[PDB]
Amino acid sequence: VQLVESGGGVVQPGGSLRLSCAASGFRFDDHAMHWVRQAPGKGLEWVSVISGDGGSTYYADSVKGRFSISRDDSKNSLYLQMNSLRTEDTALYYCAKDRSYGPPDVFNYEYGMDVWGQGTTVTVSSASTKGPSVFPLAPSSKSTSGGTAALGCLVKDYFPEPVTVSWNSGALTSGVHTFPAVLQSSGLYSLSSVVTVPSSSLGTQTYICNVNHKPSNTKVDKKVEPKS
Amino acid sequence: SVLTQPPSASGTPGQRVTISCSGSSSNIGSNTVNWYQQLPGTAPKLLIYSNNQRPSGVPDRFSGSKSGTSASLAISGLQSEDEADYYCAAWDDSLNWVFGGGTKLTVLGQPKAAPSVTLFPPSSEELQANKATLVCLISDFYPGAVTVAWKADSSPVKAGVETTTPSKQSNNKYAASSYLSLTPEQWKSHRSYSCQVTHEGSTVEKTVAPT
């Protein structure tokens, strides 16, 4: 009764992709299937449906002609072939199961979409890939207040979205808070992770942010110390 | 083919809250509605199909009504786990499934917290890197309607700033961040900058001066 997907990633505008979705726990000749995309932070948007029992497909109007969709009940899979993408297709893509097949066109009054997948991220652009630039944001009296003071690391200007910053190789879990990355007009991401620590302990112990960029192979440790 | 619905609804925990949708004639006229709940981060759930039929696993607090060309979810008594998006669906003879606009929920329970603000100037290595970025962090401000304004020595600025949307933490309050882009010569040009945040009329501002 599970739905998994695969096939996402980063392509430049003009490329092509092949998304796939594998199901488990039922037969495919009793259910229709849906591909539903969703831009990050926004509402849903239906993309396509295929009926059970062979083929009667439909696409949304903005995606007409560019896409194609098939199923395979020999392998229990869905394929969604995407050709000639544009920059407004950066989204999560969800593989949803429609109980009681037949396009909602003929089997009205009861369609639903009961079980859902976990989605797959796809983004497009020419910005390509780039490594992060790191600075330490020092603990300061303007950040200090009474018993505690905050220090952190600013990791900026990178395209390949999944990036991680830990504190002291994963040691400090108290006060460590990485904020959501921000997407600049330049097209590159940026973020800053900060942690508070007793003001008696400004420079005393080790506070080294471990920056790892997994699409690239960047690994750098930066120490944060009070301002000179 | 638009399925107009309100963007956000509200209510105290423990009473009936309705959620409407309005489609024309190919949407709700000759078709049926579904309702989908989207908790933050997860996959969407199914709530109501065929205008009033909850499937197995949906508790008996949700109902469903379809009257002519409008539809309505009706949550009977809010709780601490129903703070989510809700979408209505249709089919539209136009030959395309249409979706709602979504509606958040605002249990409005947690008292009013104070947005803790923290501001950082561009570090030294960044100064040597021929660039400059101001960093304004906001945290712990449970009602999430924060906004930000940036200040050079006396004037407001509106260029080179990026602002995160508020994000929920573990303690179920919010956090946000904003960045200011500057060339170091502009960094030393003005004698000081500041980040101000406004929240429920109230305002708190931080300020830093170059060295």
Place this chain on the structure above:
Amino acid sequence: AYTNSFTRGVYYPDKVFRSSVLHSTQDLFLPFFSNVTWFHANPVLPFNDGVYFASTEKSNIIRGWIFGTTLDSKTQSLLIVNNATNVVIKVCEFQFCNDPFLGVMESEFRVYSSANNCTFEYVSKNLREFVFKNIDGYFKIYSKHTPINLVRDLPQGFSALEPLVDLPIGINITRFQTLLALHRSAYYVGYLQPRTFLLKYNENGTITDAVDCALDPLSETKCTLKSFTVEKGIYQTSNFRVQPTESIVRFPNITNLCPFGEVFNATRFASVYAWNRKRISNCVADYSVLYNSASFSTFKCYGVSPTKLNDLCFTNVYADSFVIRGDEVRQIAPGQTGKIADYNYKLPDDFTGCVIAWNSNNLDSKVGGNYNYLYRLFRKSNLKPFERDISTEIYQAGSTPCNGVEGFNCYFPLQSYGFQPTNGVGYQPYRVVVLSFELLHAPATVCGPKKSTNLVKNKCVNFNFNGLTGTGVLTESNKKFLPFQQFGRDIADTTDAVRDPQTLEILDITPCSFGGVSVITPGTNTSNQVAVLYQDVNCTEVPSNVFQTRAGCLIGAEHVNNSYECDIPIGAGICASYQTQS
């Protein structure tokens, strides 16, 4: 700011000379004592029906108007301008500044930036009034220039406006503006409504005075008499008529439930090739209750939405029913192909009923397989809409007639579905009910549930009692019909009682308070105060001194306890006088 006109905005309704003749007209006028906007120095105003427009100065700041619907391109508009030279009427498609004006070097005209497609051209303190109107593609302009002895405030007085221009444009108008000469080195806007006036003509033929006949009772009396001096008396001036609010409509409950409950809940449906066909007759069929019996899998209609079938009525309803597969429900639709929708059933292309279908795998299928449902697959031709073929002749495919013995190229015409419960959807049994309606010529058959609103009482109402349409106040009765009589009539044959179908109680129907209105005046040569008699109307339903008489309700006179000789006769022993004044 807002200000009060007094007697302003009177124009000569047309040519044709005329002298001393209190002539009466119906037209679009600016009512007397109106609420006129005030502007200082401007914005986009409406037009909606003509415009009065005054202005005051010694310099010339007001430099014409601009008219139209959009005040831009994509639609046509008028433009009336005056530089220090002279007037410039113009009709093109323009592009108007949202704040258009002209300067005062003395270089100017930042008004528009486009003059395309011009379809009409023309070129060549103080109080300056104008009346603009637009009827039948003609844009009429009346005007007058009076000299004030003030600088910029709206004065009082009478001055009729003489026609100036006439333009056969055709232009639509919904909005207008103004134009002003800036500084580089006061105006009003009324609107016109359909009124009736009484104009007094001089012996030279000019309008010297007027009466607005809808201001007050004295003016309505002057209009009724066609004079400017009324002598003491009492005058019938018009009529009253308590208006009715809302309007109830309640019929009877529902008898013939109209039994869908055995065409949808039958123990055993028909096969498709000999499909069943029921005809429904006079009944009360609620389609919305059928709509949410809450198990269906296709509820699709083409001619009509199902919820708006709850208020129509027909002559005959056909309901066909049968049983087919899962993947063949797409063939029960107008204009299809494939066996079914071409062998055991065919719909016409201008269909109007609803196709309903649902799953019945748990009831018509059985372990081992129910083989009792037959479907046809061989036919020598197609079918008409709603045709039916129940024959079982041995079809011959090839050229050879085989005569009752099958084999090569002649086969039996019917196969059987094998409905096994271990089948996927696509071979599972679906039950199908098709409705169709017709409106030939028949008197009355199945209708919907005519929404019977709630019955109100003691208010002039607009009512319908299962056919009886009327107006009036409804009241609880104390008469007793015979238990088959619906409504009661008076002598002279007017409905005066009804019986409510649902609760079966008798209610009287009395008319809505109505009557004449009279105006009592001491004479305009004595006073301009007035009293008003609403004849035989109860004085609580008329819309100080309100006084009830056997002759009606009197407003504007006080009741005293003295007794004098009669002056103005009201009635039933009551007289009025102008003494105690008032």
